[PDB]
Amino acid sequence: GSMEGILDFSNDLDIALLDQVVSTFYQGSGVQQKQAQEILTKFQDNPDAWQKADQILQFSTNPQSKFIALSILDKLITRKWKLLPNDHRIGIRNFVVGMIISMCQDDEVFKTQKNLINKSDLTLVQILKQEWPQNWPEFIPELIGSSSSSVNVCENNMIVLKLLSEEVFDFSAEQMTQAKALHLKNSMSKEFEQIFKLCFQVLEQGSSSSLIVATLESLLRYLHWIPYRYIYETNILELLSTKFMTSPDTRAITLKCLTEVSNLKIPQDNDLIKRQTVLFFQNTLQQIATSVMPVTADLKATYANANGNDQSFLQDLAMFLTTYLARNRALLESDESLRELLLNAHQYLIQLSKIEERELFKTTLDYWHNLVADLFYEPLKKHIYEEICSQLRLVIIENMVRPEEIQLYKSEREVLVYLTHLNVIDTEEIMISKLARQIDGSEWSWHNINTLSWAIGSISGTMSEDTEKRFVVTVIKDLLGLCEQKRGKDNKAVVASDIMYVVGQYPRFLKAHWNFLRTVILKLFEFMHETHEGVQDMACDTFIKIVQKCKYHFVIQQPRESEPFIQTIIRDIQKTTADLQPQQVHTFYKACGIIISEERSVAERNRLLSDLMQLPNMAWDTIVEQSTANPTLLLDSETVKIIANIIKTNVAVCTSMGADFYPQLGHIYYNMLQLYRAVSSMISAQVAAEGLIATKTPKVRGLRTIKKEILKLVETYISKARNLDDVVKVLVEPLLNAVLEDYMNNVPDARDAEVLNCMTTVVEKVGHMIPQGVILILQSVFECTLDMINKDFTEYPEHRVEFYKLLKVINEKSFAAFLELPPAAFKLFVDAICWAFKHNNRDVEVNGLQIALDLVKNIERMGNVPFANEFHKNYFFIFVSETFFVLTDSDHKSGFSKQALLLMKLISLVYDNKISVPLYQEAEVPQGTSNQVYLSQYLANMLSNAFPHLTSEQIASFLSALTKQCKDLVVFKGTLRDFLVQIKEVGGDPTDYLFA
Amino acid sequence: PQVQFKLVLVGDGGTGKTTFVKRHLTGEFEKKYVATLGVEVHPLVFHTNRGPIKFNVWDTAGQEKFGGLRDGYYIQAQCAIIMFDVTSRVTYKNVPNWHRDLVRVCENIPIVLCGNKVDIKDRKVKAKSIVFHRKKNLQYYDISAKSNYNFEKPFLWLARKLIGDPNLEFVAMPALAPPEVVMDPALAAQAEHDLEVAQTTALPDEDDDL
Amino acid sequence: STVDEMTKKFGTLTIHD
Amino acid sequence: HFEPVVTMEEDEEVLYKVRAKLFRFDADAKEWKERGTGDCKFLKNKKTNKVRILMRRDKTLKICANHIIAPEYTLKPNVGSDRSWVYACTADIAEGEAEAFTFAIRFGSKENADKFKEEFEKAQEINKK
Numbered sequence A: 001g002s003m004e005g006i007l008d009f010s011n012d013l014d015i016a017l018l019d020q021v022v023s024t025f026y027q028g029s030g031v032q033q034k035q036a037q038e039i040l041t042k043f044q045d046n047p048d049a050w051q052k053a054d055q056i057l058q059f060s061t062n063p064q065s066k067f068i069a070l071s072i073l074d075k076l077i078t079r080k081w082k083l084l085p086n087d088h089r090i091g092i093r094n095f096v097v098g099m100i101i102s103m104c105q106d107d108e109v110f111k112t113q114k115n116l117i118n119k120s121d122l123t124l125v126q127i128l129k130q131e132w133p134q135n136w137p138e139f140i141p142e143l144i145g146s147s148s149s150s151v152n153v154c155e156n157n158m159i160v161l162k163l164l165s166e167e168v169f170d171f172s173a174e175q176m177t178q179a180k181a182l183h184l185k186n187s188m189s190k191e192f193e194q195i196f197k198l199c200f201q202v203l204e205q206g207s208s209s210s211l212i213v214a215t216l217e218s219l220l221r222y223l224h225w226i227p228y229r230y231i232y233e234t235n236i237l238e239l240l241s242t243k244f245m246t247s248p249d250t251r252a253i254t255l256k257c258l259t260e261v262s263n264l265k266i267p268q269d270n271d272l273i274k275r276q277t278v279l280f281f282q283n284t285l286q287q288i289a290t291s292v293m294p295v296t297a298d299l300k301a302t303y304a305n306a307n308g309n310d311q312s313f314l315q316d317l318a319m320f321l322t323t324y325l326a327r328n329r330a331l332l333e334s335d336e337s338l339r340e341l342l343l344n345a346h347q348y349l350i351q352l353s354k355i356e357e358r359e360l361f362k363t364t365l366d367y368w369h370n371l372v373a374d375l376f377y378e379p380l381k382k383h384i385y386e387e388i389c390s391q392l393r394l395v396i397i398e399n400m401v402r403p404e405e406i407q408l409y410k411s412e413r414e415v416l417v418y419l420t421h422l423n424v425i426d427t428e429e430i431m432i433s434k435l436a437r438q439i440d441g442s443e444w445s446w447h448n449i450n451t452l453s454w455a456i457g458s459i460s461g462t463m464s465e466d467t468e469k470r471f472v473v474t475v476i477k478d479l480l481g482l483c484e485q486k487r488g489k490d491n492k493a494v495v496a497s498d499i500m501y502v503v504g505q506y507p508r509f510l511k512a513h514w515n516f517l518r519t520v521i522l523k524l525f526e527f528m529h530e531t532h533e534g535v536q537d538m539a540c541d542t543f544i545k546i547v548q549k550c551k552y553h554f555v556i557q558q559p560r561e562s563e564p565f566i567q568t569i570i571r572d573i574q575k576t577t578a579d580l581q582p583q584q585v586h587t588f589y590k591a592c593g594i595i596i597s598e599e600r601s602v603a604e605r606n607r608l609l610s611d612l613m614q615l616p617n618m619a620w621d622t623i624v625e626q627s628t629a630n631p632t633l634l635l636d637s638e639t640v641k642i643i644a645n646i647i648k649t650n651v652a653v654c655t656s657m658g659a660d661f662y663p664q665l666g667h668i669y670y671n672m673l674q675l676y677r678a679v680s681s682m683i684s685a686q687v688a689a690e691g692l693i694a695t696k697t698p699k700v701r702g703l704r705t706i707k708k709e710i711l712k713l714v715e716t717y718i719s720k721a722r723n724l725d726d727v728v729k730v731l732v733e734p735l736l737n738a739v740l741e742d743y744m745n746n747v748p749d750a751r752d753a754e755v756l757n758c759m760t761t762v763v764e765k766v767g768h769m770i771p772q773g774v775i776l777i778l779q780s781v782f783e784c785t786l787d788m789i790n791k792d793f794t795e796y797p798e799h800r801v802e803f804y805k806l807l808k809v810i811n812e813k814s815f816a817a818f819l820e821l822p823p824a825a826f827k828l829f830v831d832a833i834c835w836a837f838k839h840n841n842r843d844v845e846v847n848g849l850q851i852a853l854d855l856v857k858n859i860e861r862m863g864n865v866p867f868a869n870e871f872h873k874n875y876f877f878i879f880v881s882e883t884f885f886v887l888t889d890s891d892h893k894s895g896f897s898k899q900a901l902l903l904m905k906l907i908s909l910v911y912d913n914k915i916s917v918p919l920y921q922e923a924e925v926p927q928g929t930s931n932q933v934y935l936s937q938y939l940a941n942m943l944s945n946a947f948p949h950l951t952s953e954q955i956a957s958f959l960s961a962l963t964k965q966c967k968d969l970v971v972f973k974g975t976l977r978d979f980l981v982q983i984k985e986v987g988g989d990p991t992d993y994l995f996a
Numbered sequence B: 001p002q003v004q005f006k007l008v009l010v011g012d013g014g015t016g017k018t019t020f021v022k023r024h025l026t027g028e029f030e031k032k033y034v035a036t037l038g039v040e041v042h043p044l045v046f047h048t049n050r051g052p053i054k055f056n057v058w059d060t061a062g063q064e065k066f067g068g069l070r071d072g073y074y075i076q077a078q079c080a081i082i083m084f085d086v087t088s089r090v091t092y093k094n095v096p097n098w099h100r101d102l103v104r105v106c107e108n109i110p111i112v113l114c115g116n117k118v119d120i121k122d123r124k125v126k127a128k129s130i131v132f133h134r135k136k137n138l139q140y141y142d143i144s145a146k147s148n149y150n151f152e153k154p155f156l157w158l159a160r161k162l163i164g165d166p167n168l169e170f171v172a173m174p175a176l177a178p179p180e181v182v183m184d185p186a187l188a189a190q191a192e193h194d195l196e197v198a199q200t201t202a203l204p205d206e207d208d209d210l
Numbered sequence C: 001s002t003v004d005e006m007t008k009k010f011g012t013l014t015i016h017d
Numbered sequence D: 001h002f003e004p005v006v007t008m009e010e011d012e013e014v015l016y017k018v019r020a021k022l023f024r025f026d027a028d029a030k031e032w033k034e035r036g037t038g039d040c041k042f043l044k045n046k047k048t049n050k051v052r053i054l055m056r057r058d059k060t061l062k063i064c065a066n067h068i069i070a071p072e073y074t075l076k077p078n079v080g081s082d083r084s085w086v087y088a089c090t091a092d093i094a095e096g097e098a099e100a101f102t103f104a105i106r107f108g109s110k111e112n113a114d115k116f117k118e119e120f121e122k123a124q125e126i127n128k129k
C-alpha cells in the first residue's frame, strides 16, 4: 500500500518511508518482507535512483538504507560514469571522500558501522578505477598525509589500499580491458614506494592492533605482486617472524603473510637471501613452540575442541609449513645446526596430520607425497627422515579410506607405497602389530578392521615376491583365526569380506599358487549362496576382480588338473548362480567372458562361448518358439523379465568379449530383430489403447527394456567389432529396417533415445562403407527428432544429447549424406546447429560448436564449386551473427573458447580470400568490392544495432583489431574479452584494442 | 524458535541452491529450473541435542539479470553456503568472485563450500582441482540434492560453529501420538476426486532404487 | 607346507558359528 | 570409600519395519512430490493397542509420516508402479497440525510392497478392536 510510494519518482523521496521499506525487509518476515523486497529491487533498478543517493547518505539514520544508496552509486560508477557531466563526477567523488572522513572522525560510528564504512571504501575504489591517476594524481600523497593525523583514518586508508590492490591485481582479468589493467597496475607499481614507506612505519611504531591487523591485511594482498626486494632488503621479515607471531590478533594474518612470502619470486643463488629465508622460518617456529604450543601438543584434541579461532589457525599453520618446506626444505637438510628445525617443523606436520578433518588431511597428504617421492628418488635424503616416516606409516594406515572414495585412496596408496619401499621391514611390522591388536580386541571394531584391510591391500606388488609370500600368508592366517574367534554372523561376515578383499588385492600371490587360487574361487561360490546382506555382492565383485587380474590361470590347464578351470566353472554355472539376483548373474557371466577371450584358439573360444551361453540360449529358443507361434505370451510380465535377462546376459558377455562375441550374436541376431518388431507393435498398440500414460506402466516399460537392451547389445558389439565387412554385410541392413521406421512412426514419448545412440556407433565404425544407409538414418530420425527438441531447451534431455552426437559423427564420417538433403532440409540442419549454440547444457553446446566448425572445414574442402558458393551466400553471415550473439549475451560463458575458435575460422576465410563469390547480393554494394570490406561493413552495422551505446570508433577499432588478429588465437580471444567488458559500460576507450 | 541464525546461500545460476533448500524444507526434488528473482527467505529448523536451531535461509539469485540487491542481501549474515556445480567448470571458476563479495560484507563468519550434482556420472570439476577453500578456511563438502549425498553435512557443520559445540548432533524430533480423525460425508467427494487423479498420474523416477 | 596349511584353514572359513 | 567421577517411541512396539520413499500429491499442480526416504515403521502403542505409521527421513531424522492406520483407508495401485501403494489420509501430523493428504509410498521391490499391504491390513484389524 503505502510502501509503493517510493517508486513514485514524481515527488520528493520520503526518507522515513524508505527506512520502513528497508526495515520491513531486513527485520520483518513472510508476506511483509517479500513485498518490501520487490519494491527495493524496483527502486534500486530505477535508472534515476543514484540522484537521490547523497540525499539518503546525509538524511537517513539507517545503515541498511545507506548501504543500498552506495550499491546504486556503485552501479552507476562501474557502468554509466563517463556519460555523466564532469561536475557530477567531482561532486560524487567529494561526498564519498567527505562521508568516509566524516565516519572515521566519529569513534561511535567508526566502531559500530564497519559494514557501511567498508562499502563506502569499495565505492571509493570504483571511482579510482575510473579516475586515478590521470584525473586524481595527488590521491596517494593526500592519503598518506591524512594517515599521520587520525589513527581511525589511517586504519581505514589501509582497508582502501587493500581493496585497491585486490581490484587491480587479483580481480582485474575478467572485469577490465587488458590496457586498463596494465594502466592501473603500472600506476600502483609507480607509487608503491610511498605506500610501503607508510606500512613499514606503522608496523614498527605499532600503537593499535586494529590498525596493525588492517596494515597486515593490506600487506597480504601486496605480496601477490610486489618485487621481493621490499621484503628481503628491508627489516620487515624480522617483524613478521617475531613481533607479530607473539600477539594472537596479529598472529593469524601474519602466518598468511609468511605463507605468501614463501612463494615470492627470489634469486635462487644468493647466500644472504638463503640465510634470510632460513631465518624467518627459524623465528616463526620458535614463536609457535613458546607462544602457541610445543612440538608434543596433541593437536587432534585441540582442533576437535574448536575453541576460538584455533581450527583456522591450525589450518593456516599446515598451509605455512607445507608451502615453505615444499619450496625450501633443501636449505635445511645440509647444515647440522638446522637439523632440529627441519625435524620439528615435520613433527608439527605429523601432529597436524592426526587431526580429524578430511580437507586438512588432504592438504598435508599432498606435502607427504611431495616428500616421500623426493626421498625415493633423491640421493642421501631418506636417512634424515627415518623417524618422521615411521610415524607417517601409522598415520596413513590408521586413516586409510575405502577404494570407492577414488581420489583420497589414490593419494594415500601412492604415499604408502613409497613409505613401504623406503622401509619394508617397518611397514610390515606396523601392519602385523595392528593385526595383533584386532585379534586381542583392544582396537577391535568393524570400521578398524576394514581400514587395516584397505591399508594392507594398498601396498601390493611393492615387497619382493618372496617377502610378499611370507607377509600374505601371515596376514591371511591371522584373519582366518580372527573369523573363527569371533561370534555372531555379523562379525564373521565383516572379516570374511576383509579376508576376501585382501586376497583380491594380491594377484601375484594368486598367480604363483594355483591350489590356493582354486580354494578362494570355490569359497566365493559357497558365498554366492549366503542370504546375509552384502555377501553375495562381495562374492561377485571379488570374483570378477580376481578374474580380471589372473585371466591366464583359468584359461590354461594347470598341473594336476584334468582341464582348464574355466570348463569347471561353466559346468556348475546353474548350481553356482542359482541363489543370485539377475544383475549378479550378469557379472558372473561377464567374468566368465573375460576368461574365454584369453583362449586364442578359435575353435576352443567359440566352443567355450556356446557352452557358457547354454542356459540363456535354451531359455531363448523356447521363448522364440512360444511367442512367434502365439504373440499372446509376450503380454505376461514374467516372460518379459526372462527375455530382458537373456539379452542383459548377452550384453554382459559381449562387453568383456567384444569382437569374439560374433558367433553368439549370430545365433540370436535375426530372431532378436524379429522380437524387436513384435515388442514395438505391442508398445504402439498399448499407446493407442491406454493413451500416453501407457509409457509409464510396468507392462510397457518392461517391453521398452527389451528394445533398449537389444539396441545396447548391438551397439556394444559394433563398437568393438574387428570384422567390419561382416558388420556391413550381415548386421546393418537388418538393423536399420528393424529400428528406423519404428522410431519415426512412434509418437515422441514412445521413441527410444537409445536408437540414436546405437546409430551414432554404427556411423562411427562403418559410416564410410554405407553412404546409402546413412541417408536412411537421417531421413528416419533427423526432422522428427528436431521437432521434439526445438520448442524449449529442457524437454527430451537424452534425445537432445544423442541427436547432436549423431549429427557430429555423420558430419565427420559421411558428409555426403548432408549434400543429398533437399535445400529446405539442409536449412533445418543449419537451424539445428545454431540451436545447439544457445544451450546451457554443455553436452549439446560443445557438439553444436564442433559441428559448426567441422561443417565450415568440410565446405572449404570442396573448393570452388556451386554448393560451397551457395552455402556461403546463404549461411556465412548466419553463423557469424549467431556466434557473436552467444559470445556477447553473458549466458554462454562456458563455451567462450570454441565460440572464439569458430568465429576466428569464419573471419580467416574472408581474410585469406577463401570464399570465391560476392557475399553481398545484386546492387547492394559497388561492383569491385572485396569480401573483407563488406565483412567490416556488415559487422560494423550488426554491432551498432545490437549495442547502440558503443560509438562508431569503438566498433571500427574493435573490428580492425579483431580481423588483424585472426591468425593468432589467444590474442583474438583477448580482443573478444576486451569487447565483453566494453559492452557492459559507456564510453570505453577505443585505443584499448591496440594492446599488443 | 528464539535461537536463530541468518544464512546466505550464494553461487552461480543452475547450481541447485533452491533445489537443495526445498529438499530440506519439504523433502521434494524439484526437477525444473525456475530461476530465483533476487532472494527468497525460508525458515529452516533442525532438532539437536542442545535444543532446536533455526536458520533463516536467504536463497539468493545466481543469474546476474535476476540478481536483485546482490551483496545487499549479505548484511548481518551469520553464516553462508557457497554453491557450485561439479558438472560445470565455470561455476567453480566463479567461486572466488562469490567469496570476494561475501567476505567484504561478512568479515568473520563460518562458511561452507558445496560442490553439488556429484550424482552425475560425467563429473567435470575433479576432486583434485577443488582447493580454493583451503587458504580461505571454508569447510568443503561434495553434495547432491538428488541422491542426498552429504545433504545434512553443511547445516550440521554450521550448527557446530555457531552454537560453539563440536559434539552437537542432529536427533530424532518428538513423534506425538496422532489423532483418530473419523471422516465426514462433506469431504468424501473431494478426497474421492483427488485420489482418482493421483492413481492415474505416474510416480516420478520409477527406475530409481527406492 | 606353510602355504598348504593356510590353504586348508581357508577351506573351512564360514559365516556360521 | 572413594567417590566416583561425578523421541517419544518408548511406549510403542515395532510390528513391521520397511525401507521406503513417500510422496504426497500436490492437487494444485498435476504432480507428485517426494516427502521423504527412510525406515517406515508400524508402531503398536502398549497403552491403547493403536497402530500408526512412523516414517523418518535419513540423516536429518525429521518426521515425514505420522498417522493412524485407520480401518477406512484402502491401498490402491499406481498406474506407473508394481511396487507402490496410494491412499487417502484424513489426518497426518508430520508437519505440525493435522491435515489431509493423498499419499503414495514406493518400496524396493514388488515383494516388499506386497508384505506392506499384508501388514497394513493386519494393523487395521487391530484398530477396529
Ligand SMILES: Nc1nc2c(ncn2[C@@H]2O[C@H](COP(=O)(O)OP(=O)(O)OP(=O)(O)O)[C@@H](O)[C@H]2O)c(=O)[nH]1
Pocket: B011, B012, B013, B014, B015, B016, B017, B018, B019, B020, B030, B031, B032, B033, B034, B035, B036, B037, B060, B061, B062, B063, B116, B117, B118, B119, B120, B143, B144, B145, B146, B147
Ligand atoms: N542431477 C542433479 N541435478 C540437480 C541437483 N540439484 C539441483 N539440480 C538441478 O538444478 C536445476 C536448477 O536448480 P536451482 O535450485 O534452480 O538452481 P539455483 O542455484 O537455485 O538457480 P538460481 O535460482 O538461478 O540461483 C534443477 O532443474 C535441478 O534438477 C542435484 O543434486 N543433482
Ligand SMILES: [Mg+2]
Pocket: B017, B018, B019, B034, B035, B036, B059, B060, B061, B062
Ligand atoms: Mg534459485
Ligand code: NA
Pocket: A403, A453, A454, A455, A456, A457, A458, A505
Ligand atoms: Na586396497
